[PDB]
Every structure is written in C-alpha cells, then in structure tokens.
Design an enzyme around this catalytic site. Structure first.
Site, mmCIF file in Angstrom:
data_model
loop_
_atom_site.group_PDB
_atom_site.id
_atom_site.type_symbol
_atom_site.label_atom_id
_atom_site.label_comp_id
_atom_site.label_asym_id
_atom_site.label_seq_id
_atom_site.Cartn_x
_atom_site.Cartn_y
_atom_site.Cartn_z
ATOM 1 N N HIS B 40 0.789 -1.238 0.000
ATOM 2 C CA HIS B 40 0.000 0.000 0.000
ATOM 3 C C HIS B 40 0.827 1.298 0.000
ATOM 4 C CE1 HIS B 40 0.051 -0.104 4.555
ATOM 5 N NE2 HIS B 40 0.160 1.198 4.352
ATOM 6 N N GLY B 142 3.304 0.959 15.915
ATOM 7 C CA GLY B 142 2.929 0.153 14.756
ATOM 8 C C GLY B 142 3.036 0.872 13.423
ATOM 9 N N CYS B 144 3.909 1.732 9.798
ATOM 10 C CA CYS B 144 3.971 0.811 8.656
ATOM 11 C C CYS B 144 5.363 0.339 8.288
ATOM 12 C CB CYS B 144 3.317 1.439 7.429
ATOM 13 S SG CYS B 144 1.577 1.675 7.642
#
Lengths: 299, 299
Positions: B40, B142, B144
């Site tokens: 993504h 967290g 990416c």
C-alpha cells in the site's frame, strides 16, 4: 496503547565483553582501549562478606584478568580502580565504539538496560531509576556489569551499571565513574531499600500522552491547588509535586490545552475513585516509567 | 521472569530502510538484494478506500520507488508483489544481512518489534500476537513496515510486519510472505476484530516464573480438572486451555514441583477472589505476554 520502548540496542551490543577473575565472571563495557566492570569481579563469594578491595587488588596482575569480546581474547595491559569500578587497559581499541558520554541521572529518570549473560547480549528493557535509587528486575535483568543508557541521535549516554542484587528481586548499581546510586555498597550485608514511591511527574506525563492519543475520560472541570494535591499524593504513596515539576509539564500542558493543576485534579480523582473497568492507553494501572521527555519524544 | 525483555535489536537495525512512493513514505526490510514493505506504499488516501493493487502497480516504474539505507540511496532494479508485500530488487546486497528465516507464528506467541520512523530505528518492544490476531500499540509503535522478530542463537526469525492501524487503535499486519494474520485486509474499511481474550497458557507460564523467583503466596491446596477450570476461565475472558497447553507446561511443572492442574486451581482462585492488593513479581495484574519458552529462556 503506549509501548514502553527501549532504545535500539545496536550501539551498545558491540561494547559488551566478559571479564573473568579466578572463578568470578561478569559483564564489562568495552569503550576504546578501556574495559569497565564492577570491582567485585576480584571477589569470591567468601570475599564479599568483608571485602578489602585495595588489599585484594594489590594481589592481582594484568594477567589475573581474562577479557573476552565474543570469540576474541583481549589482552589487558593495565589495571586500576575508580570508585566501585575496575578499569582495564587493553591492547586493542574497540572498532565499534560509538559516540558516547558518561552522565549521572536523577531518580525518576528513565533508561534502557541491555541485560547480558557472561558477555553476551540477552535482552533489552526500558526502566526508571526508582525514588529509592534501585532498579526492579530479576537476576538476569540485573546481571552484573550490564549497563543502562539513553541514545540521543548518534550518541550513547551511559548512566548506569548493575552491581548488586538486593532481596526480593531488587538491584543496586553505579554510574560509569563507579559512584553508587543511593546508600548502597558492593558487599554482602543487610541492605534494605528505602520506601519506594510512585513517580508523580511521570504519571502526569503519561496522562498527557493519553490525551494526545485521544483518551479523555479521566478529565474534569474540577480545580485543585498544589498543596491539596500533595495532601492526596502522600496518602497514596505518591511523590510530592514541586513547582519545578509543574514547569517541566509546560510543553505537554500547552500541546493539550490542559492546565497542570487540572491534570492533578484528574489524577486526584483517579487515585480516590479508581478507573472502574476503564483503561488508559490499554492499561488498568497508572504508568510511572515515562518521563515528560519520553512522552514528548514518542508522541 | 520479572521484566518483559525485547531481543537485542542490533542485527535488525542494519536491515531497516525507508521506501517512498509518490507522497507516501514507510519502513522497509532490506535482506540480501530484496527490500520488503507493505504494498500500500503505492496507494494514496483515495486509493486506500478501494485499492486495485494490480492496476496501481502496472504503471509504476522502478524509478517510482525511492529506497534509502541511512544516507545511501539504493537503486531499485526490479519490482513485484508477493501477496500483500511489495518486493523491490535493489542493485546491492545488504552487507549487514544476518542469518535469517521467515516464519509464521501462532496467536498467543511473542516477538520483538523494532519500531521505526521513516527508516530510522526509534525503539524496541516485546509483545504478543493477540488471540484476535492483533497487536496493541500507538501510531509510532505500529508504524507501517516495522517488523517483528525472534532471535534464536545466531539466526533472526522474522515473523511480522505492520500494515494497518485499525479503528480500535490496534494494529494488523502480515508475515514476511505477505499473508495477513486474521481476517484483515490492506484497505481503509470497517474491519471486524474478534474478542481479545487473555492468553491462559502465558499467564500459567508467568505464575511458574513467579514460583521459581520465590513468590508463591497464590498457591493453594485446592484441586481441579481442565474441564472445571475452563468453566471459570471462560467467565473471565480467558481462552480455553487444551491438553496440548497442559503438555507444554510439563517442563516448568517438573522444575517447580507444581502440577499443571494445581497451578490452574491457583489461577481459578486468583480470578474469582482477585489478588487483594498483593503483587505477583511486582505486578498488580496477571501478565499474559510471556510464553512458556520466554519463561524458561529468561529464568
């Protein structure tokens, strides 16, 4: 939630060695051509009941010390004692030496510990210097010669070395000049820690980190004074909040628009009422091992 | 034991890169001559609502991806898609590649995460894969492309990579083959997460660690069956304990002299009556982020 992160340990891992004197083996810090370790490496278990270190060290020579960096034998070419530290001059300068500083931290301040097992890095954890000048942890967590540190960009500020294990999993230690934190000594006697208290400044900072992450349920319209908060603080084994502490909370107060004494009122209510099945940052308890600096940095 | 240690992050630090596509920048994993990151990265905000990854990638050249390791800009000479991962071939093999494996871990298992901001190692924490296939944390925790790993001997076992932040504030991600853990997808949508139960096996492992470290007030003379224990445990949102779990605690059982089912009856009472202001290993709550292997390794 809000993870209690340790600093990336890479820069400190390359500095860890083992030092053997007789039957005693512990961890040492290899920076340039010097290795730093607890001076009680020259002490057997018997020696620790009444150690005369100057008496015990005169009987040692450079060959009395076996220093090993991984699989490589280092050769010691000099030795001296600086406070509770043993300083060993070696024939090789550590090629993985990072930019470093030796600093003495204050109680309530935080750092990462790289727990080491006979020279070898085992794990890393974030902790705070407790108000009673001890570090909590198990025998591995506080394995002798393991160092505490902060990393600021490319520079490692070493602030702690594990020396002693006190009853019920409590550790005492030294700065990198060999000066103990708190009223502790490197001998086997009866050493009780002082009264451990909750680091109030840290809890408030963590409540500010909660607000920045969208947690707001604990806030109120209420207003308290510094004196009335400190009446409720001491009642629940919290540290007195100085005016100097409320100054340090300035940037976090501004970022959230919540006045320090308003957060104190929120903390006061939390102390008296509890959380009631609610969480703050995924926690059921009030965290005190994040300084305002840690919060601002990690937020 | 006491402290929830992360693995030394050194071997992983040298593998972290930043990858930029268009306006998006995230973390990537550089091993041998391939860089791994969430696919993504090729998506914009509007793309993420309904992303067509095949179509979005087909008009991207090798130059569309900017990869830098520290200050060294790496020339990308290939690109492909492995499930939910982008695989970018670079012209240079990572000289700091450690011995490594890719493994898929089970729910309830533990690993370390090196959290990074735009390729730069920021912090390291220990966590468990939740029974609902999520990882709790903040946006930075967290961020990416940050990876999860264990270190067994000289070998780094990569198991996880952060992809998505869920509405609840938790994190979803894949293994290093790019297959998601749980029923999650890489698209900005509403995503049903299962109940976050307590990892029963891990609590029992932790209670064993408490016994080993001389903290055994919670033990009693009561008995229980696996069946009767689960009826209590299911009521406090604990995952069912299986015969397989009982067998796993066998070595810790033999070491402590405490039969698994007896430790279950100790847990049952703790769940019903509470701890009553007492602490286990310095904690006011029951820990479920230590595996049996973690307990054995750290004791």
């Amino acid at each position: 939630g809000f993870r209690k992160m340790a600093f990336p340990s890479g820069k400190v891992e390359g500095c860890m060695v083992q030092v053997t004197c007789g039957t005693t083996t512990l961890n040492g810090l290899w920076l340039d051509d010097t290795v730093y370790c607890p001076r009680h490496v020259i002490c057997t278990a018997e020696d620790m009941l009444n150690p005369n270190y100057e008496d015990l060290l005169i009987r040692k020579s450079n060959h009395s010390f076996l220093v090993q960096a991984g699989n490589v034998q280092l050769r010691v070419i000099g030795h001296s004692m600086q406070n509770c530290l043993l300083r060993l001059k070696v024939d090789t300068s550590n090629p993985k030496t990072p930019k470093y500083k030796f600093v003495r931290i204050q109680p309530g301040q935080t750092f990462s510990v790289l727990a080491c097992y006979n020279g070898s890095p085992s794990g890393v954890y974030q902790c705070a210097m407790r108000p009673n000048h001890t570090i909590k942890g198990s025998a591995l967590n506080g394995s002798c010669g393991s160092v505490g540190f902060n990393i600021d960009y490319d520079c490692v500020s070493f602030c702690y070395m594990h020396h002693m294990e006190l009853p019920t999993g409590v550790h005492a230690g030294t700065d990198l000049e060999g000066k103990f934190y708190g009223p502790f000594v490197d001998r086997q006697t009866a050493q009780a820690a002082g009264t451990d208290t909750t680091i109030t400044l840290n809890v408030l900072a963590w409540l500010y980190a909660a607000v920045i992450n969208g947690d707001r349920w604990f806030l109120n319209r209420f207003t308290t004074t510094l004196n009335d908060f400190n009446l409720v603080a001491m009642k629940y084994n919290y540290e007195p909040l100085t005016q100097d502490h409320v100054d340090i909370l300035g940037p976090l107060s501004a970022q959230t628009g919540i006045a320090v004494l308003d957060m104190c009122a929120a903390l006061k209510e939390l102390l008296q009422n509890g959380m009631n099945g609610r969480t703050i940052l995924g926690s059921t308890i009030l965290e005190d091992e994040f300084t305002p600096f840690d919060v601002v940095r990690q937020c």
